Every structure is written in structure tokens, then in C-alpha cells.
Design a protein around this ligand. Structure first.
Ligand SMILES: Cc1cc(F)cc(S(N)(=O)=O)c1
Length: 435
């Protein structure tokens, strides 16, 4: 695996030991070969699990998720997928790693897609080796891969709303259930219904993941209600997955706005990762996977691949050269390399709108490309009437940095800034000049 110009896909089935058994072996071999190496974890949770699997090996943990004194003897760095892409975009020297290891390399967040593009381009150039670790590489068509123990697979109608009757099998269960829902708001309704029926429910989303995930270990629970983020190497001591088989798809309409389309079917890779949360213990057979719909290739036309192009267009590679998407996922977007490349000051603004502003890539790009500076929030208020953001069926209002109460009416509407209460709250603070 560790010869230059090689990109290896380690596609052992879920629970095969990629992270706990194979990764320490690769790290020892890289150290023996003097390979400057980066290990990319999808989440701070996985970063912490990796420290446990690697404990004692000289690894520099570039994450506050791990509390370790680094010796300065390390040639192996560990950071999150997003941190790698972030450091590439920022005016900061990222070492030219001889060996690039991405764990949970199926992650379809823009920063992970961008990281795979940059690394795969360095490998194609003959500059580096890479190992992508995932049971479900891009374009996988198998929703039912092998597991450590036999899984009971059942196609069943799964509730997406509160229910009074017709789903006795959901609550009649005495074990632990991980339940994949298409959105935070859909999970809130299911979580409330289950809590009302006497169930202990933990809710996971991207925004709450590190904090809430700890509850799965620190307290007894009956249900975890999670969005697609629990597809990225999150492990539970569970005996059942309920899978809606649905997700939201960010879609750019007419180059002008982003909507959250759906809910609609998950990819085969997503279905296999959801299912792959169970059947992981060879000493616990009888785990169940209940699925409520088919799969489809809903990554086609998905905004994340166009956002990944926006990020890669703004990462220095060599002179005017621009990293390509990793070949197997390079047709998911109609996009030309370099079309989103920004001039120096507009690019700094784009980075800051993402890093400090916490705006989605697409929205950060619209603001920066329009020549708006980071602290200029007039655009949050000067959009058309139909860009009005609604809060409980009434226009959302904020006090501007000027002390004026105004209707939140962004020049560019991205549904992700107001997809849930937490998102809208963060966007209100942004429109108000509070970060
Ligand atoms: C290249 C190299 C030299 C060395 F003396 C020690 C290491 S380490 N800290 O990875 O074991 C690596």
C-alpha cells in the first residue's frame, strides 16, 4: 500500500477491523519507512477512538478532542477531514504528506469530498500514496454487505411522523434501536412520540454529535434518533437499526438558491453504513435491520459535490493547477475546474464566511464572489420578499448591528441556514453581526 503513486481502497466490510486492527499496522509500517503521514478522522468522536486504537504510537493529535502532550518525535499527524481541508484553504503550511490515510472515506460532506480530491490528485501526480478506508466506496451498489454476525433484514413501512397505532413492532422491542431519520425536525417528532410511550431517547445531529454521543455511553437508552451523521463510524451497543432509508438533498436551483429537496431515498453506501451499525458482534447474533424504502443515487446533482469544487478551486496545488474530484465521484456535478477560483481578497472572505461565519460553502461563495467583505451583513436584509426567513409561520426578525429591527431576507437563500431552530438561531446571530 505504502509505495508512492498508489491509491488503495481498503473496502473490508463494516466491523472488519479497519480502524482498530489495520490502521495501527499501517502506522507502524509508515513509521518504519519514514513516511510523513496524515490520518483523517470524519469526527472528533472517531479521532478519540483512533487515539485509543493507536495509544502509545507516536501520533500528533491535531484536535482538542484528545488531551495528549505531543513529544515533537511524531511524523504521523491525526486531524479531522474538515481540519485538513480548512488548513489547505488557510494561509498556513500543510506538510506534503507522503502517505494520506482517510478513515470513513465515504463521508459526502463538502470538506471530505474536497480532501479526497486534493489527495487523489497528489497521488495521480506521482507525489504521494493514499489509503481510503471504507466498506462503501463511491458508486457501491450493495446495501447489504457482509457483517460480523448474521443480520435479519426486513422491508417494512417505517413511521416518519408521530403514530397512535399500526407500528406495534417499533415499541414492543426490549433492546436498543438506532433509528435513522431524514432530518433533525423529523427526528424531533419521532423522539417526542417515543418519549410519550415511555422510551428513553437520545437525538444525534451534526451540530450536537460530540456532546450527545457521550450520552449513549454514560446513560441507559432505548432509542438513538440520528440523522445520516451516524453513518461515519459512530458505534452503538445496539441490537436493531430502524432505517427510514431517506435523507434531505441540498439542490442549487438556477444557480440562485439552495433548497433541501426530499426527503428522498439514501444511496446504497448510506443504506449499507446505516445497516452496518448492527451485526458487528459475532457473539451477539439476531441483530435486526428494518428498512422503509429503496435506495437511489441521490448524490447525483447533490450540492455537496459542487461545493467541493468551490473548495478545491480555492486550494493552491502547483502554479495555476487545480485538484480534480476523486475519479469515481467526479461526475456527480456539472462543474468546470477553476470556474469558482477567487482573487486573493475575495478568497480570504470566502474562507472566513465558512470558518468564522459558519455559512454553507455555496452561500459563502455567493457573498465573497459578490465582493462583500466578511463583516458587511447588509445582504442578510436586502433580498426579495420570497427570500423572507420564517420563524413559527412569522418573518424572523433581528436587531441589526445598527440597532434597527429588520426582517431576515437574505439576498441569497440557502435552506441550510434555517433547516432547524439551532441553524436559524446561528444565522440570526450572524445577520446581527454577533460573529
Ligand atoms: C523517522 C523517524 C525517526 C525517529 F528517530 C523516530 C520516529 S518515530 N517517533 O515515529 O518513532 C520516526
Amino acid at each position: 500500500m505504502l509505495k508512492k503513486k498508489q491509491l488503495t481502497v481498503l473496502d473490508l466490510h463494516p466491523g472488519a477491523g479497519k480502524t482498530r486492527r489495520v490502521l495501527p499496522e499501517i502506522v507502524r509500517e509508515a513509521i518504519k519507512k519514514r513516511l510523513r503521514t496524515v490520518i483523517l478522522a470524519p469526527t472528533r468522536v472517531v479521532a478519540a477512538e483512533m487515539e485509543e486504537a493507536l495509544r502509545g504510537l507516536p501520533v500528533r493529535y491535531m484536535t482538542t478532542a484528545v488531551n495528549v502532550t505531543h513529544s515533537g518525535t511524531e511524523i504521523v499527524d491525526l486531524m479531522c477531514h474538515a481540519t485538513f481541508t480548512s488548513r489547505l484553504l488557510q494561509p498556513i503550511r500543510v506538510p506534503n504528506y507522503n502517505l494520506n490515510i482517510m478513515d470513513e472515506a465515504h463521508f459526502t460532506d463538502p470538506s471530505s469530498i474536497a480532501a479526497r480530491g486534493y489527495i487523489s490528485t497528489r497521488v495521480e501526480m506521482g507525489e504521494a500514496a493514499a489509503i481510503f478506508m471504507t466498506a462503501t466506496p463511491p458508486g457501491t451498489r450493495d446495501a447489504f454487505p457482509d457483517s460480523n454476525s448474521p443480520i435479519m433484514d426486513t422491508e417494512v413501512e417505517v413511521p416518519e411522523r408521530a403514530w397512535s397505532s399500526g407500528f406495534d413492532w417499533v415499541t414492543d422491542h426490549s433492546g436498543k434501536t438506532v433509528w435513522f431519520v431524514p432530518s433533525v425536525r423529523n427526528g424531533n417528532e419521532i423522539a417526542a412520540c417515543l418519549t410519550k410511550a415511555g422510551k428513553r431517547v437520545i437525538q444525534l445531529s451534526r451540530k450536537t454529535f460530540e456532546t450527545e454521543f457521550q450520552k449513549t455511553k454514560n446513560q441507559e437508552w432505548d432509542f438513538v434518533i440520528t440523522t445520516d451523521i451516524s453513518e461515519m463510524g459512530a458505534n452503538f451497543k445496539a441490537d436493531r437499526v430502524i432505517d427510514s432509508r431517506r435523507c434531505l438533498k441540498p439542490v442549487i436551483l438556477d444557480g440562485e438558491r439552495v433548497i433541501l429537496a426530499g426527503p428522498m431515498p439514501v444511496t446504497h453506501a448510506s443504506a449499507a453504513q446505516r445497516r452496518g451499525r448492527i451485526g458487528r458482534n459475532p457473539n451477539k447474533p439476531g441483530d435486526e435491520y428494518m428498512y422503509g424504502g429503496g435506495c437511489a443515487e441521490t448524490d447525483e446533482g447533490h450540492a455537496h459535490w459542487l461545493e467541493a469544487r468551490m473548495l478545491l478551486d480555492n486550494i493552491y496545488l502547483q502554479d495555476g493547477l487545480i485538484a480534480s474530484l476523486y475519479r469515481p465521484e467526479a461526475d456527480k456535478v456539472a462543474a468546470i475546474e477553476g470556474e469558482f477560483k477567487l482573487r486573493t481578497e475575495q478568497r480570504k472572505t470566502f474562507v472566513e464566511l465558512m470558518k468564522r461565519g459558519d455559512l454553507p460553502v455555496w452561500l459563502a461563495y455567493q457573498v465573497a464572489s459578490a465582493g462583500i467583505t466578511y463583516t458587511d451583513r447588509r445582504w442578510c436584509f436586502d433580498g426579495t420578499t420570497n427570500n423572507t426567513i420564517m420563524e413559527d409561520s412569522v418573518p424572523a426578525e433581528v436587531w441589526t448591528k445598527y440597532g434597527e429591527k429588520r426582517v431576515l431576507k437574505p439576498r441569497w437563500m440557502d435552506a441550510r441556514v434555517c433547516s432547524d431552530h439551532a441553524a436559524l438561531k446561528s444565522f440570526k446571530e450572524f445577520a446581527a453581526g454577533k460573529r
